[PDB]
Design a protein around this ligand. Structure first.
Ligand SMILES: C/C=C(/C)CC/C=C(\C)CCC=C(C)C
Length: 150
């Protein structure tokens, strides 16, 4: 609960095998529930699609809960309540860093990141900061591309 789903384009087949250790490949767009549907992140826009691995099929991250509900080529929209989006800015800042090669876990990057936030109180992007200081629900459009298995 806190999450309504809408299928915008039906998928090809029966549910994949969202087994622990599954490589799940997908595109996503993130938007405010603006009238404008303001765009925060768009995977395609930066080019490459997103990659994750299922951590534990029995304890799933919020994004895994969405993803695993989908079929290949399904394009589904997830309206997610404010109670789920307080972490999106920090999650987004790490994605953007990955998009620029920088690895948000490597030493120099992670330390530079903490330093920069401790000093200038900012995630490093004006929009993520505005979003952080103003909680709200979000919509995610997810295009499930491919699923591999361990
Ligand atoms: C930073 C560590 C990760 C494992 C990234 C996982 C998070 C995502 C890939 C964001 C996509 C989430 C949506 C709700 C579309």
């Amino acid at each position: 609960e806190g999450v309504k789903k809408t299928i915008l384009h039906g998928g090809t087949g029966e549910l994949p095998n969202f087994i622990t250790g599954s490589r799940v490949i997908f595109h996503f767009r993130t938007m405010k529930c603006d009238e404008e549907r303001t765009v925060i992140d768009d995977s395609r826009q930066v080019g490459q699609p997103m990659h994750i691995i299922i951590g534990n099929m029995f304890k799933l991250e919020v994004w895994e809960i969405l993803l695993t509900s989908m079929r290949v080529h399904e394009v589904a929209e997830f309206w997610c309540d404010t109670i789920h989006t307080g972490v999106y800015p920090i999650l987004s800042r790490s994605l953007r860093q990955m998009a620029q090669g920088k690895d948000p876990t490597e030493w120099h990057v992670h330390t530079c990141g903490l330093a920069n936030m401790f000093a200038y109180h900012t995630l490093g992007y004006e929009d993520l900061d505005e979003l952080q200081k103003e909680p709200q629900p979000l919509v995610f459009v997810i295009e499930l591309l491919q699923v591999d298995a361990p």
